[PDB]
Design a protein around this ligand. Sequence first.
Ligand SMILES: Nc1ncnc2c1ncn2[C@@H]1O[C@H](COP(=O)(O)OP(=O)(O)OP(=O)(O)O)[C@@H](O)[C@H]1O
Ligand SMILES: Nc1ncnc2c1ncn2[C@@H]1O[C@H](COP(=O)(O)OP(=O)(O)OP(=O)(O)O)[C@@H](O)[C@H]1O
Ligand SMILES: Nc1ncnc2c1ncn2[C@@H]1O[C@H](COP(=O)(O)OP(=O)(O)O)[C@@H](O)[C@H]1O
Ligand SMILES: [Mg+2]
Ligand SMILES: [Mg+2]
Ligand SMILES: [Mg+2]
Ligand SMILES: [Mg+2]
Ligand SMILES: [Mg+2]
Lengths: 143, 385, 244, 109, 246, 240, 390
Amino acid sequence: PGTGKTMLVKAVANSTKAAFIRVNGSEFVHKYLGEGPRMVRDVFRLARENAPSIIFIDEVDSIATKRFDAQTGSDREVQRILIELLTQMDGFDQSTNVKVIMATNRADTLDPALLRPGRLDRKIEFPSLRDRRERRLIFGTIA
Amino acid sequence: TRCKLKLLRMERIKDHLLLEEEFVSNSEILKPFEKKQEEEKKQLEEIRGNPLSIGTLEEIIDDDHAIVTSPTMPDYYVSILSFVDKELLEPGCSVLLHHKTMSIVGVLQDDADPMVSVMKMDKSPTESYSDIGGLESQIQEIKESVELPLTHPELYEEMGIKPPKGVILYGAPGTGKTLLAKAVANQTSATFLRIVGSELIQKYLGDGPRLCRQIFKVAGENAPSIVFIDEIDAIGTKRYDSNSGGEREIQRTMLELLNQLDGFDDRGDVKVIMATNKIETLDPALIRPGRIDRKILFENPDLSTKKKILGIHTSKMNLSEDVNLETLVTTKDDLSGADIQAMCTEAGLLALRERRMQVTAEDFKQAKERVMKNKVEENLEGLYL
Amino acid sequence: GSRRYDSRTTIFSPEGRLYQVEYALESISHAGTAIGIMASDGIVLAAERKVTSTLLEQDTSTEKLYKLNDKIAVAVAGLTADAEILINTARIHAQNYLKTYNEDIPVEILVRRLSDIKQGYTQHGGLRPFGVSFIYAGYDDRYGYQLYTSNPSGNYTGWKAISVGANTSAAQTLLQMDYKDDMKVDDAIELALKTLSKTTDSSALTYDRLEFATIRKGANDGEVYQKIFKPQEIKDILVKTGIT
Amino acid sequence: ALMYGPPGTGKTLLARACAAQTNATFLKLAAPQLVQMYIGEGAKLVRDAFALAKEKAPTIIFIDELDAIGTKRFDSEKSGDREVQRTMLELLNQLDGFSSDDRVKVLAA
Amino acid sequence: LTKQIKEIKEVIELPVKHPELFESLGIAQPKGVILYGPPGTGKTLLARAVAHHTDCKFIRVSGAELVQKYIGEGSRMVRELFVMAREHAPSIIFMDEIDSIGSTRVEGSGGGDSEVQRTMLELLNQLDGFETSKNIKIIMATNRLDILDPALLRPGRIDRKIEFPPPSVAARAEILRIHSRKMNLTRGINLRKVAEKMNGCSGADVKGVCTEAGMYALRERRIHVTQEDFELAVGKVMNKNQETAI
Amino acid sequence: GYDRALSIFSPDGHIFQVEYALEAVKRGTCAVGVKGKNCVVLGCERRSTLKLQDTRITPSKVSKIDSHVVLSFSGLNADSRILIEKARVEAQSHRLTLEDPVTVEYLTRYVAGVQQRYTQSGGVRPFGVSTLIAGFDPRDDEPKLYQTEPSGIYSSWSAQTIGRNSKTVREFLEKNYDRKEPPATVEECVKLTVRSLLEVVQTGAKNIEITVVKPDSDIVALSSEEINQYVTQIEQEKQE
Amino acid sequence: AAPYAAKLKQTENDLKDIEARIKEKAGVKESDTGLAPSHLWDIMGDRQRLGEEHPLQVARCTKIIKKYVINLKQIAKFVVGLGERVSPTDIEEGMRVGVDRSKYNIELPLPPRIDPSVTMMTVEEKPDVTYSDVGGCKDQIEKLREVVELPLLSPERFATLGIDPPKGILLYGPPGTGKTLCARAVANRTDATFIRVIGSELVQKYVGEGARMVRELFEMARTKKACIIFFDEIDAVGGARFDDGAGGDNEVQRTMLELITQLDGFDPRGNIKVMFATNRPNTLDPALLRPGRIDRKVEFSLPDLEGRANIFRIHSKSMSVERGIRWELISRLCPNSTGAELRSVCTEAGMFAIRARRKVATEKDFLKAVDKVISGYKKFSSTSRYMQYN
Ligand SMILES: Nc1ncnc2c1ncn2[C@@H]1O[C@H](COP(=O)(O)OP(=O)(O)OP(=O)(O)O)[C@@H](O)[C@H]1O
Ligand SMILES: Nc1ncnc2c1ncn2[C@@H]1O[C@H](COP(=O)(O)OP(=O)(O)OP(=O)(O)O)[C@@H](O)[C@H]1O
Ligand SMILES: Nc1ncnc2c1ncn2[C@@H]1O[C@H](COP(=O)(O)OP(=O)(O)O)[C@@H](O)[C@H]1O
Ligand SMILES: [Mg+2]
Ligand SMILES: [Mg+2]
Ligand SMILES: [Mg+2]
Ligand SMILES: [Mg+2]
Ligand SMILES: [Mg+2]
């Protein structure tokens, strides 16, 4: 936590000049019924419509969890949201759209069904360690 | 041939004739079927119509009323009407409801589950007794406890002694603990449930006892039954670390298995076979003589016994005349019967890489040498002498 | 008190076995391999090291071959740390016997003495057993050349050719097909290298990862000279016998 | 007030005498009944118990075996329960002054 | 890895294509085939390949309980996988000990991913009436063979053990060419000289030299993957691998 | 010091370290003792699974304590030497101070008394060895044959066997050994002890060792040839 | 060949036509009865379908307003009036009530509790292992009878003195001593409703659900008239409390604490006797043990020599045995043994007689059996380890 993941994405929202759809990871959990599946279906269509377009989920971690009880109602409703995301991630192919870009400060809890190939492909690293050169560079801009 | 066809021909046209007589002369009499019969079937169908809503009988009140739960939320104080056995409706049972005004119009439902199918083996193993080369004495401690009281329940009832209950087949690896279970499961033709001891550790908390209570309930319903528990050693020794209840969880499950095995229930006929390789680990409460009655023990096949084992695996095989069975026995000195099976399988595989149907003497000598190196002696009895 | 923290390394198991001595056997099966062959006219001791990087100076290094006097060498397989302790108690008992009888120690005495030291720790004391196994090659006029192996039980028996360390089983089966009684010291060398060449974990067999020492009667006047080979005699004898 | 001591000295007995003699409102509560398996249904019960105690004021809430709302000392990264925790911290906010703690006395045993 | 294709063809492909050769000899069916080696040397890639040639279903189970939503659980599943496997057979059940995600299951059990392997192997030695000839083989992958407990190395339990060495300088050249066929080239490039210069250790690494060369093509807006791009790529891939691996 | 009470009573009334000690003697190789008219014969199992093992220099199962007392053993080979050292010591100590060699019954009483001591000394585990002490008293020709065990109790026997498969050998000796009439001579007795062993060794002329001890300090070991001859005769006799 | 190959097809059509006659007589669709009392039941169900005894939507009361506040299951709350069927005296707090399908009005009070579906499954049908089978005439049998049997049988004698009878018994001893055997014996005798719960089944999946189960069990008992609840094998749920600091016994002792609190209440609890049977008292918490929740400890211990003589007589009396069996001789030869080894003794005596082809068991056969049982299984004796936890 706290290396400038989001702040690098802010910069990218300015420069692109392509539509940009910004959703928290908690907009997808609804309280009524089937509405989780209904949020995903809308969000991907809306990108394709005004293509080319970037989708950003600030934190996707709670939706992309690794373990499910599958007895409690709450879990059974997240499984549906997570199946839809995976299904429409392969449908995104052969559009001008660049796929969902998403961040998480946790890496052990991710569902590895997202990190299979053909879905999420490129993994960026942000280090905690700072060498002496790279530290002076950060001090320079704030000061 | 002649007489079996001849008597069947007479029985199956005499059956024809009696069914025609009952049908014609119970349709012209209105007190039996006739007038009631052609109106009840059409009415019963028509009145309740469809859709029939499935629900679950939550509980039954003794007065021909019940409280049933629709999956759609509303509960109902229903009545129990025509064409249902009222003793068959119990908590958990699924019922069919009349959708206009909620009343149980019956249960027609088998309610087949993947919980009964997972325990059940449709076994047809090609193994029969006397695919066990020698160790004849051990075979005839197992058959006296499990198989024989199903064949002749007369002997134990004349004598006045209760049949022995339970067995544990333990010893060195490779002495055929699993192979004996398969011989005795084939003959009895009782319901043979199989469950490996590893499965009783699962991740969630308190699920261990629910799983263990379920297995014995399927068995007691299906008497006479066998419950083979393969490598019950596995729960004591290992620590999969998926179950976050830790060691405390494994102990509470074990205690559940002890109660289901004898305890208070007073179950039906359930023999148990418990296979293990290390009886030390097993909790002393389980092995205790009262739940099990006879502790069969095995040992490493002898040099005379190994001739019998070899004769079984070399019979199926095709050979040249150049082979000598006797030089393959003597070289190995105290090697189990699992290794003898692999020695035959390895040789036939070398001959199939060379692509000749015959398994010659050389394929046997290369296979035997490779199998002695793969093994790992025994630094238990090396310590000794 | 002290009882809570106590391992008890001397009790029997429920089946009449000693767990802790069994386990000492297990840690000896990871260490490097050592082989000895008995010819008519000498003994070959040949051991493979567990280290092999090039920074390490394996040339002056000896961690497998030790002389106990001027007629009995041993090879080691196990904890090299532990083994130096028993070797000084042996060196001293070998010499006491020369002091009191003015006659070189029989091989049978010096082997039987070390065994009982090891036995000693599993009988009483509560100390963990020793984690070592020796091959003794020695010469005495009573039986000629003799070979003996002892393990952490303390049981020792003689041998014609034996091997302790990794894949004890595999090394014994290769030797068993080839060994013959009319062997000379030249023939034995060639069987020793070849057998280590077939078991070594790495396909390549180098002169630097092998230690090697013989005892030959070709020293004049009916005597025996122990030589632990230099790294330049090993190198030449690996090209001679055609292993590389 | 808190009552602590060996089992059998009569901590529960003494509270029973107090209930019959003072003719104040006596709200019996047991600490394991409070804990509930639903997510956050156990927290809703604490606030409802003190809210009822305002109407009937003045009141005594006698809690038995506070070991079911145990101790907060866990922080593991593998499980940790963190259910008993939540309803215990809801109980502390009603013991605080925001909620009137001058009409409501608490007997803990 | 040309030798390895021929060894697993023996035990997997042939008893499906010809159940008669195995009846005639009197040889028992082969069951388990254990694959072990350093990651990236392609033990999975060979698995997918054999399944496609024989024409059998490939059922990958990772040990995860999340993807199971139709049964619901992978908690009491052993035979419940086989029920689905028997409908779609011939089958190849695949199980891999990942030992970097789910590393706490491996502990204290010779693999908490080996609970899956042994329990499923136990039902497979004797089931139904597929004793004449079986239509489900079972394949286990482990980074190292060290972890597997002795009750999976006994004689007669498996039938074949494949080992995968890290690729030699000869092998790297072949493997680097299969990935280069997908993208542009330039005359005169010696794909052999880049394999030697790359010390490497994996075929995963080798594939990363091709993708990284395509990254250097974008920044300069080249029209073709040229000889300069590979020299820069080799470096970027090797330096990133040595900082994480040491 | 180190003095933990390793050996204690269980509530069933057996010491568990002593029952464990006696199970250890069961896995041991087999040694048989039979006393004829005026000899004893000690037959022992050589583990012949081993190959490339020299028999010239390898310690045997029969170790002479004195020049007329021999001792055989089953159990842990390593621990056995510890009894035999204290025994060779005790035999010369008794010659020194009272004069006259030890009588077989006294040499047992010492050896049996050591195994008993190590079942009370705190810090010591019991011995894993049972012995057959045989021989002739000095100036007499009554054969004597004793058995000790890790309980420390000792008894004389007409025939006995310790070690693995002992029930099968003992059953054969209860039928083939008449208590009234011993094997007539020294030659018949050897033929009774070999014939008992060949049931559980499942033959191998090299496997069997026979040591005969006769009155007046005559200890001889029957050579391989002799053993082979006897085996062939019995096999041929029994075969016929 | 042909005369029978063609007539084998003919008889297969004539049987398929005989299936149509048998289907038509009884119908066999929507049948679940003997189709004889269901004709009359058919006319009775037409009168119930016209009457609105049903449907009655099942709800529950949340607050009585001197008027009621009802909650439906489909979650929507209503203020209702009163039915002409019932007095307002019978409508209580939290109670389940049925309300009209239409304009919601309270009709009939219902018996409470929706949890009954695990704890209802353990209301026992009372097996019979008669009291003769219990070994000897031990004191241990007579100390159980003073707790369970006597206050239900004869409350005349307790009324005079003024003693209120004890309630708790703790049966504890090494495995195989007949802790359970007595439980089954008092199960039929007693005649009060008998509810046995295994100590493992109180452990549930969710934090706080194990406390519910045991809480409703008692509520049901108080309704019934005179109960005995037999907690079997409560090693699980019983372990003294610790806090590892890392996970604690948090989920186990949540249950254990609920049980303690209903055996002293803040009220007198109903007529409820409680029997605990464990293989270790070591495990149990000091809060369970002291009098008022476990009044009388009774030890079932290994029987002495005379005990082992009476327990041989109780297994053997069905057996055919000769007249010359001196049961004193083989009881003397059997060392310190549990009653569970003595069953296996007699079974093995009968076993060697069936192998030998003899109908009557002899003296030789009983000695062999004693030899086989004690020799081998002295290696596997449960008795030695478990006697030490005692
Ligand atoms: N006594 C025997 N006679 C003939 N064949 C045998 C014998 N014992 C083992 N085999 C052969 O070895 C195969 C494997 O044996 P099995 O699975 O019974 O070994 P096991 O002792 O049960 O191993 P584990 O210790 O894993 O339980 C059998 O299918 C059989 O063909
Ligand atoms: N006192 C006794 N008299 C007669 N038979 C007995 C006696 N005790 C035990 N038995 C026999 O032993 C069998 C097993 O006993 P039981 O099931 O009561 O064990 P337990 O005392 O509950 O011990 P555990 O619960 O540890 O198994 C009984 O079914 C009965 O046949
Ligand atoms: N020898 C090879 N030939 C071709 N491709 C290879 C080779 N080795 C590795 N690869 C590439 O690396 C990828 C990762 O290897 P994988 O098949 O997942 O098995 P593992 O990761 O267990 O070694 C392969 O899918 C393939 O694209
Ligand atoms: Mg952020
Ligand atoms: Mg098996
Ligand atoms: Mg209190
Ligand atoms: Mg892989
Ligand atoms: Mg019991």
